[PDB]
Amino acid sequence: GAYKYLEELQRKKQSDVMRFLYRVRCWEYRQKNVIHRASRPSRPDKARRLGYKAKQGFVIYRIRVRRGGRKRPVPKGATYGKPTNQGVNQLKYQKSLRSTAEERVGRRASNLRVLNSYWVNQDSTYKYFEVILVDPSHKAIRRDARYNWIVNPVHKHREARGLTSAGKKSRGINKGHLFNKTKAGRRHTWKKHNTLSLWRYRS
Amino acid sequence: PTRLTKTRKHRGNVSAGKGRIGKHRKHPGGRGKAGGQHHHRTNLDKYHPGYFGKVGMRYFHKQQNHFWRPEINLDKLWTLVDSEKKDEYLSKSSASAAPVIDTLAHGYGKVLGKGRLPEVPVIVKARFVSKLAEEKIRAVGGVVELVA
Amino acid sequence: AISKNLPLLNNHFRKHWQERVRVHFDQAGKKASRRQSRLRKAAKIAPRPIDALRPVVRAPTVKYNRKVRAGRGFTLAELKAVGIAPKYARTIGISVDHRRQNKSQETFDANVARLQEYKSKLVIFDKKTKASEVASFEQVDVSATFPVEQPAPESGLRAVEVPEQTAYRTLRLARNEKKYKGIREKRAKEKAEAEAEKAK
Amino acid sequence: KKERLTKEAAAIAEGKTAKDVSPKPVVVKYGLNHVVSLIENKKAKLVLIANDV
Amino acid sequence: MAKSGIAAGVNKGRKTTAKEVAPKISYRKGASSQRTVFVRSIVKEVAGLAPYERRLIELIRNAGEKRAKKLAKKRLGTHKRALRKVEEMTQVIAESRR
Amino acid sequence: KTWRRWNVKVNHNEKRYATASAIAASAVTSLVLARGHRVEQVKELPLVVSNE
RNA sequence: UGACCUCAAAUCAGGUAGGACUACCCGCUGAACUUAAGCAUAUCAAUAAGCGGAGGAAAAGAAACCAACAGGGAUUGCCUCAGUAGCGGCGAGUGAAGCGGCAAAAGCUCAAAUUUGAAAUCUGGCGUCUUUGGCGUCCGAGUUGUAAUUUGAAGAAGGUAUCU
RNA sequence: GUGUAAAGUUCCUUCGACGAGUCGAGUUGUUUGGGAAUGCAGCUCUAAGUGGGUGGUAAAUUCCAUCUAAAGCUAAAUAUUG
């Protein structure tokens, strides 16, 4: 079908066609509200890959997020501590801009569940994301055996807990030796390794 | 039990055994290994020489399973022979029929050559042997068979 | 702070350790409740065994080569050799592992024999089976009925055969060959190209 | 389609395969994936593409 | 058999009777297919070349193989990827000479 | 604090030693009497009764 | 005279979110006292305070894993590894992982495929019934793709011996 | 039970679609036991198809081993000053 062509063409982001489309769409998205509803995916193939279905109850929001690092919000740059903690600039947020996009969109549409999200476009001041959300109260979702799972309350605001793809990426939730500290949760691992386990018959 | 401690015997005496001049204090001298190069040098130099400095090369990601090789000497080698059949083996062993001692299956990596063997042929299966261990095994008419 | 001839210690108690002290007062209570959970699980599905049949596998690393232990599941090839589909095998008390393979014949044969032994004692009920036949069975412990058994170490009498080269010399030569293999191969390649290039 | 299915259900009552009662359809193909696959298999004789997608 | 049977040296380890292993389908991941070869050729026609890829072609045409590789590594990041990109851009040139 | 030591380990062999010693001491009339048991009208120790 | 796309309005039909609790849980943000017998890297500590989000557990989870063996085989926890490899004004300090024994064990789902001889899919209104829903019907959603079919352990399309 | 249905099982042939501002690279900051750089994040660059990742000393050349990312669900063993 056409989704394979769509996939292969979006990988040519520096081609003349894709560059033209990115210019035009960046201008148009910049002309709208910071968060707005998208009538449809601008990348239907990318939405399909991430679990979106053209059903009632699937929603798309476009959001615009400021680029760059995280300036320390201390008044006049005074940190009141040791010189190792005097940095104000060149500091970085530990979450991605994709996660911030997801969280702000989920906060705006508080009745929906954030399914996933993807990058759509970019300039020097903003990155643009489209967030796929699912309505858990819609019967087309509740009667869908492939999407009942997100109706259960353990998925309330999963994007705020780092349970989306971007969130699990930023949490370091991966297998292997490169993720020893964060494999099962960084703070859980730290607590496990800093607990004094004492038994009845001490060894 | 607290009733056996000297805290019970210090009751009634002012300083609890800590002295009137010294006056048991919080941390005179520092905490832990503080001052090991300055005012505790006389202790570390006398009792822990070699403490400061680097020696040798680092080993990133050292897996101790690679270096597993428990040793068994020759004077302890016949303890791996079945106890109920040791005495029969010590008598009837010959070049035609000698006991087989699988040292790896008993948890040993290298056969070393301390001690003396019975002048009795044996077949020793080992991952590694020393030069003298194998010379002593061959002298009693035995053999070392390398395994992995 | 450092006084007398004593060992130097590493007591890692400089954090707020007392907020993370886990004392296992509930060891006996957890033992008892664990036993009760185990009885409930067994009584729910009797006479079907509570344990799936597990394979026997070699423990990894040069330190545990000698030992053999229970694996996670039988490979697809092993189940193929006894004519059981993995989807079907999972429903008759056999564990499957799609990840493990059989490079060598020894473990494969051990697990095929183990599967055939379990398969001979299996009796699969159906609708025609009445409760009189079902009550004629006792819930066995599969982990004990088909235990993981260590191969016996070689022992007993065998003929002594003494090679001319000692074992120590063999080990030394193997070490030397491994140590200088690369440089000897590079030297030989250079020698061959030199004496067959100018000899053109 | 409802009328055709009614006729085919009448035909299956008579014992026929319901494929003889209905002629082979000759219609317009649509759907982007379907038409792309038809083009890739050299089955489309003519493709009309919208200019405002 | 396959191992030397001893604990030291080249090809050390215990001898075992080898059993032929049926390859897993996951190991076919890098293989190309008719579907992806076809789709990628049309997308190349529609999309064209990237700005750095045109720059690479000029360097290759001007006999700068050493120059092109340094650019391709600076762009793609690694020397292994730069080698494949320069080879791909020479094949593009080789297909424009007819 | 609750992480005081409450249970104490005893070597299994020593525990069995003491159990055997106590069983043996149960057959000494002087020990049973010093122990406080009103056993003066039992003709012999150990006292063994039938299985009924 | 009507479609479509995009964007609005309504006290439109029907829903949903907010707030509370704190012991455990998932993240963000984030010190200093303190130790180093001073102190700035370090330490306290990836802790306290601050902010966002849950559940009866949470999280993790069926390998882009561990290994280097004769190989293991989702995740989690315990014992051990180990106060070790390592990190560290290589000072004070700090510090995991593989293997091994055990507790518990359970596996799977999409996207990428032309149903194309028939959008086979679904929300809603109305009616009716035996009502956590069924049936009928009519709008609507949907071809910029809703069903069936496949998930790499495979699998598909043809042929194939028949069996369970 | 509408089971000429659904599913599995043997063998042959032709195939076998597998996730992109992502992987990866540089640099900056933070963090880690991770040490010519463990993870995370920002910015710049930006892929491929037996390709890609990993193989705890930076680099090029040659192999080998092992998985299959950039999409998703899932009880139990575990925690519990409410």
Swiss-Prot record, chain A:
GO CC terms in record: cytosolic large ribosomal subunit
Pfam families found in the cross-reference section: Ribosomal_L15e (PF00827)
PROSITE patterns, sorted: RIBOSOMAL_L15E
Highest taxon in the source lineage: Eukaryota
One term of GO molecular function: structural constituent of ribosome
Location relative to the cell: Cytoplasm
Keywords linked to the UniProt accession: Cytoplasm, Ribonucleoprotein, Ribosomal protein
UniProt cross-references to Gene3D superfamilies, sorted A to Z: Ribosomal protein l15e
GO annotation, biological process: cytoplasmic translation
InterPro entries: Rbsml_eL15_core_dom_sf (IPR024794), Ribosomal_eL15 (IPR000439), Ribosomal_eL15_CS (IPR020925), Ribosomal_uL23/eL15/eS24_sf (IPR012678)
Role played: Component of the ribosome, a large ribonucleoprotein complex responsible for the synthesis of proteins in the cell. The small ribosomal subunit (SSU) binds messenger RNAs (mRNAs) and translates the encoded message by selecting cognate aminoacyl-transfer RNA (tRNA) molecules. The large subunit (LSU) contains the ribosomal catalytic site termed the peptidyl transferase center (PTC), which catalyzes the formation of peptide bonds, thereby polymerizing the amino acids delivered by tRNAs into a polypeptide chain.
Family: Belongs to the eukaryotic ribosomal protein eL15 family.
Subunit note: Component of the large ribosomal subunit. Mature ribosomes consist of a small (40S) and a large (60S) subunit. The 40S subunit contains about 32 different proteins and 1 molecule of RNA (18S). The 60S subunit contains 45 different proteins and 3 molecules of RNA (25S, 5.8S and 5S).
Protein name: Large ribosomal subunit protein eL15
From Swiss-Prot, chain B:
Biased composition, class Basic residues, residue ranges: 1-12, 20-41
Transmembrane stretches, start-end: none
Keyword Nucleotide-binding recorded: no
GO CC list: cytosolic large ribosomal subunit; nucleus
Alphabetized Gene3D superfamilies for the sequence: 3.100.10.10
Annotated disulfide bonds: none
Cellular location(s): Cytoplasm
Record's function text: Component of the ribosome, a large ribonucleoprotein complex responsible for the synthesis of proteins in the cell. The small ribosomal subunit (SSU) binds messenger RNAs (mRNAs) and translates the encoded message by selecting cognate aminoacyl-transfer RNA (tRNA) molecules. The large subunit (LSU) contains the ribosomal catalytic site termed the peptidyl transferase center (PTC), which catalyzes the formation of peptide bonds, thereby polymerizing the amino acids delivered by tRNAs into a polypeptide chain.
Name used for this protein in its record: Large ribosomal subunit protein uL15
From Swiss-Prot, chain D:
GO molecular function ontology, one term from the record: RNA binding
Keyword presence, Amino-acid biosynthesis: no
Compartments it resides in: Cytoplasm
One example of a Gene Ontology biological process annotation: maturation of LSU-rRNA
A GO CC term attached to the entry: cytosolic large ribosomal subunit
Assigned keywords, A-Z: Cytoplasm, Ribonucleoprotein, Ribosomal protein
Family: Belongs to the eukaryotic ribosomal protein eL8 family.
Record note on quaternary structure: Component of the large ribosomal subunit. Mature ribosomes consist of a small (40S) and a large (60S) subunit. The 40S subunit contains about 32 different proteins and 1 molecule of RNA (18S). The 60S subunit contains 45 different proteins and 3 molecules of RNA (25S, 5.8S and 5S).
Function, in words: Component of the ribosome, a large ribonucleoprotein complex responsible for the synthesis of proteins in the cell. The small ribosomal subunit (SSU) binds messenger RNAs (mRNAs) and translates the encoded message by selecting cognate aminoacyl-transfer RNA (tRNA) molecules. The large subunit (LSU) contains the ribosomal catalytic site termed the peptidyl transferase center (PTC), which catalyzes the formation of peptide bonds, thereby polymerizing the amino acids delivered by tRNAs into a polypeptide chain.
Protein known as: Large ribosomal subunit protein eL8B
From Swiss-Prot, chain F:
Compartment(s): Cytoplasm
Domain of life: Eukaryota
Disulfide feature: none
Annotated function: Component of the ribosome, a large ribonucleoprotein complex responsible for the synthesis of proteins in the cell. The small ribosomal subunit (SSU) binds messenger RNAs (mRNAs) and translates the encoded message by selecting cognate aminoacyl-transfer RNA (tRNA) molecules. The large subunit (LSU) contains the ribosomal catalytic site termed the peptidyl transferase center (PTC), which catalyzes the formation of peptide bonds, thereby polymerizing the amino acids delivered by tRNAs into a polypeptide chain.
Family assignment from sequence similarity: Belongs to the universal ribosomal protein uL4 family.
Complex formation: Component of the large ribosomal subunit. Mature ribosomes consist of a small (40S) and a large (60S) subunit. The 40S subunit contains about 32 different proteins and 1 molecule of RNA (18S). The 60S subunit contains 45 different proteins and 3 molecules of RNA (25S, 5.8S and 5S).
Protein's recorded name: Large ribosomal subunit protein uL4
Organism: Candida albicans (strain SC5314 / ATCC MYA-2876) (Yeast)
